[PDB]
């Protein structure tokens, strides 16, 4: 089976793991501090009830038999008929399902229910997430009219950005909110978060090649690439309002991992360049633009992953190079591929929202997805987890 | 030698060089500020002792010529005659004694000697450590009687668990330990810990198949299958008994990592979910007895990696598919395989247990296993490395 | 291509990657709280600045077409021409740049205007970063004379050490420096930082090989026993001058990586203890004197990178053994070799230090390195960055 070829992807799935506590770190940082071991609990939480779910029937809807195109099936419950390297591609997708539920726990930061975190998770990861992976990658409607995501700009950051922002619109501001600003009380805890996700955005855009060949190598430069320009980005914008602090800067480089991820095996470096100079600025204008309306989609899931994966799965129809993946953008000459790429855009940042917003709503109705004032006062550490971050 | 083989053996031995700070933040994060930085420098001094010791004649004791089945000779000190890929094989295996000894460092905890630890660890090392690993992994006499071991469940986790067991009753329970509880002074930071090690059992387990083929790909599959199950269970349980704090998930999700270890290439998934629904459940229980008999086995590294590593031990020889690895358990029609279990769990078990009781109580004889009454006050970090943590 | 190959080789440039920021918490644990944000920021902008010029002709300049053997030319601007592997090996060197531009922030902690460290920086990278390596790795007049340097000895711990030396005395001490010693503000970062160094170097000496083959693990071997040994000598002075501090520990354990840096493809184990040995003594030694010249070079790049990068590409020249990978040292019957290292140690601490000087003193001159007394004084946190590190 190449057996460098099954390397780079064990390699690669335990890189992706990774990202998941490292979402955790990166929000954790800039919660308070008696909120500090809820956004790190939640990352965990998110991976064990995503393990457990995609192997009870998570990947089976993913990725098993389809059904009208919208779909999979059963076949795959409980991975009954799944070997081999089906096992692998299986174990490397439920990474990509964890870090994306473990992202959207922005939305929620700082006064959510644990128990109601984890109802709403399994039902997103249910009727959200896995429809998606389905009609991208498990040969749903959307791959079949030629849609392209080569790591998840739409599974991965559209879908829990744009979800991220239906919870957040359902939950409300958190207390203060719009008096007085919340401070992160570790910025250090935050750059950790921050190191290891783009030290695990390795396996993650490049193992989406599924193999150690050239399309990997190509999108482990282009990731890099996007990155550097879009964190340059923030931090000239960072100047340009006074001083380039660290969390603009993070914030700009995840922009531009984000943007690059749908299509990290298709772009040329030149085109890497400009999606991670058009994502720092889009990314950071809708930043400031959901401040400005008042949404406390607190942690910006939403203005980074979901816009930046818009932008990212936009331009993949726009500027895909033939010589680089034989898939050609708008710019090589293609115009088809754009219109594949905008229905694909249309339709999943629609149902994202659209989808979420009922979920999150049902729930709250059924359970109530928030927590109490006074809990939210005391710190979800000690209400939620009993637990004091420090001491 | 297949480029990819060594490729993937390469990755798993930094995966696991990294658990054994990894062990050391764990732990750091659990105990008083005042002593921080000595449990994270006594991971740093067991690697680096380990892989000294190895090198010298650890290797050549765990895996050079078999004398009486019961040890190896020196025929591989200093490396002689150690090339090409043994040379692979004895770097990653030297990973694995390093681990261990951090993992016995949860004895310790707060309250002994450096100097002390070095001198019982390099004695442990050489007297239980090594003895274990050529039983079981260098044509020892237990793998001779058809015991299996596949990743450590009884080299590492009954080792290190037992042996801290043995090493808390001799050096006795921290000053006030039954007065008040001794608080964490950083949950985040065991939280990072907990994420290295949880991504570096990629390499531990999935490394140990030395290949990068469809056992490690298996080993990947339920190692991941009974970190969740046995996380979920503690989740459960701290619910039940109140709120489930985070330490409660991630030592759960440990539970089911190192009951996993000596089956990762033997079981299926089913028989994964089993280990760690089991794990889950000994695991606590083992915690709270041991809490119920006042032994002051600080970072339970002997519920957790001691009772969980009896477990899977025992659990490979019910639950072992042929389908799988060839080899088959009682449930697949074979008793024999859990006979060899059996007999290979009571002997690591005993010996682990009261030889390091031995060794122990030997060290304490000769140097004193435990700081002064003074030093423990004011924190080991101060007396033991004239350093302050935090400023 | 040897999917093999390219596994290891994707997954060490992952790992380099990691050292980067891994520098930035390293150094940021052992200044003030106040300063702890601007220190782990800079490792990022490292990151990217590198990253950008890298690509814009930084890699061109190192290893495109030779001009004179002492540079290369525009070729590879923008990665014109460069296609498949060669993309792969561009991608892994450009994270070896920016690992050195790291290092080299230790001559200018706390104290430092950003904007002038990154013209520093794109200065340095330009000219004499790119320079080195293409002298030793770009088939430059250095490696034509015969000179050797697997994994950067003089290209990256010779380079930053000499360079960080000039900054700091072009600088100037810090505040107080005299006075009253610096504590840490928090050593547990700084060992975090510790740990993501030495899982890096994995990748860094051990991916060097270009290939997963019987030279790589040699390198990871080696490159282990070097750090264990320099660990263990300053673990050793610790006690000798007192108690031995985890820093001390870890400071000792980099000493002999940066030491094995340069030889780690060439030396059996028995070269490697010695490297080791010598390294955590004559590092040791450099520590103490830069501290007794009261030079701020802060962070010590130079004592331990300079020092230790110095030793370990002389002792190539000494232990180089044939039986590893063909080339012999000195006690090999190979006096020629020896030559040709002093001449490219010569010639690379010399041009490091003046070139680094004259480039220090111009931007000072241009734009002024250091920030205001009063910045300095309520911390580059709040006054380059407008954050705070904890709350």
Same mark, same amino acid.
């Given at each position: 089976?190449?057996?460098?070829?099954?390397?780079?992807?064990?390699?690669?799935?335990?890189?992706?793991?990774?990202?998941?506590?490292?979402?955790?770190?990166?929000?954790?940082?800039?919660?308070?501090?008696?909120?500090?071991?809820?956004?790190?609990?939640?990352?965990?939480?998110?991976?064990?009830?995503?393990?457990?779910?995609?192997?009870?029937?998570?990947?089976?809807?993913?990725?098993?038999?389809?059904?009208?195109?919208?779909?999979?099936?059963?076949?795959?419950?409980?991975?009954?008929?799944?070997?081999?390297?089906?096992?692998?591609?299986?174990?490397?997708?439920?990474?990509?399902?964890?870090?994306?539920?473990?992202?959207?726990?922005?939305?929620?930061?700082?006064?959510?229910?644990?128990?109601?975190?984890?109802?709403?998770?399994?039902?997103?990861?249910?009727?959200?997430?896995?429809?998606?992976?389905?009609?991208?990658?498990?040969?749903?409607?959307?791959?079949?009219?030629?849609?392209?995501?080569?790591?998840?700009?739409? =599974? $991965?950051?559209?879908? !829990?950005?744009?979800? @991220?922002?239906? *919870?957040? +619109?359902? #939950? %409300?501001?958190?207390? &203060?909110?719009?008096?007085?600003?919340?401070?992160?009380?570790?910025?250090?805890?935050?750059?950790?978060?921050?190191?290891?996700?783009?030290?695990?955005?390795?396996?993650?855009?490049?193992?989406?090649?599924?193999?150690?060949?050239?399309?990997?190598?190509?999108?482990? =430069? $282009?990731?890099?690439? !996007?990155?550097?320009? @879009?964190?340059? *980005?923030? +931090?000239? #914008? %960072?100047?340009?309002? &006074?001083?380039?602090?660290?969390?603009?800067?993070?914030?700009?480089?995840?922009?531009?991992?984000?943007?690059?991820?749908?299509?990290?095996?298709?772009?040329?470096?030149?085109?890497?360049?400009?999606?991670?100079?058009?994502?720092?600025?889009?990314?950071?204008?809708?930043?400031?633009?959901?401040?400005?309306?008042?949404?406390?989609?607190?942690?910006?899931?939403?203005?980074?992953?979901?816009? &930046?994966?818009?932008?990212?799965?936009?331009?993949?129809?726009?500027?895909?190079?033939?010589?680089?993946?034989?898939?050609?953008?708008?710019?090589?000459?293609?115009?088809?591929?754009?219109?594949?790429?905008?229905?694909?855009?249309?339709?999943?940042?629609?149902?994202?929202?659209?989808?979420?917003?009922?979920?999150?709503?049902?729930?709250?109705?059924?359970?109530?997805?928030?927590?109490?004032?006074?809990?939210?006062?005391?710190?979800?550490?000690?209400?939620?987890?009993?637990?004091?971050?420090?001491?």
């Amino acid at each position: 089976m190449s057996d460098g070829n099954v390397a780079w992807i064990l390699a690669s799935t335990a890189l992706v793991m990774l990202m998941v506590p490292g979402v955790g770190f990166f929000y954790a940082g800039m919660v308070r501090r008696k909120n500090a071991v809820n956004m790190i609990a939640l990352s965990f939480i998110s991976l064990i009830i995503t393990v457990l779910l995609w192997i009870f029937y998570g990947y089976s809807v993913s990725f098993g038999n389809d059904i009208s195109g919208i779909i999979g099936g059963l076949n795959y419950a409980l991975l009954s008929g799944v070997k081999g390297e089906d096992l692998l591609f299986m174990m490397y997708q439920m990474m990509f399902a964890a870090v994306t539920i473990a992202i959207l726990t922005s939305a929620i930061a700082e006064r959510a229910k644990v128990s109601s975190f984890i109802l709403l998770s399994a039902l997103w990861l249910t009727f959200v997430y896995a429809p998606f992976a389905h009609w991208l990658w498990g040969g749903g409607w959307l791959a079949k009219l030629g849609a392209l995501d080569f790591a998840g700009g739409m =599974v $991965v950051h559209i879908s !829990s950005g744009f979800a @991220a922002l239906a *919870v957040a +619109m359902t #939950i %409300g501001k958190r207390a &203060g909110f719009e008096e007085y600003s919340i401070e992160p009380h570790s910025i250090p805890l935050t750059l950790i978060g921050a190191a290891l996700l783009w030290f695990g955005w390795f396996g993650f855009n490049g193992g989406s090649a599924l193999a150690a060949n050239d399309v990997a190598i190509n999108a482990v =430069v $282009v990731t890099n690439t !996007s990155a550097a320009v @879009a964190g340059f *980005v923030w +931090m000239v #914008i %960072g100047w340009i309002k &006074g001083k380039p602090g660290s969390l603009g800067i993070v914030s700009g480089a995840i922009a531009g991992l984000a943007a690059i991820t749908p299509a990290a095996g298709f772009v040329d470096v030149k085109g890497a360049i400009v999606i991670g100079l058009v994502a720092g600025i889009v990314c950071y204008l809708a930043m400031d633009f959901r401040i400005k309306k008042k949404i406390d989609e607190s942690l910006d899931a939403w203005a980074i992953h979901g816009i &930046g994966g818009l932008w990212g799965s936009v331009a993949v129809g726009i500027l895909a190079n033939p010589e680089v993946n034989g898939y050609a953008g708008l710019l090589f000459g293609n115009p088809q591929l754009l219109v594949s790429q905008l229905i694909a855009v249309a339709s999943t940042t629609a149902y994202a929202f659209l989808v979420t917003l009922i979920l999150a709503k049902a729930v709250d109705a059924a359970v109530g997805l928030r927590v109490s004032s006074q809990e939210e006062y005391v710190g979800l550490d000690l209400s939620q987890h009993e637990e004091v971050a420090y001491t």
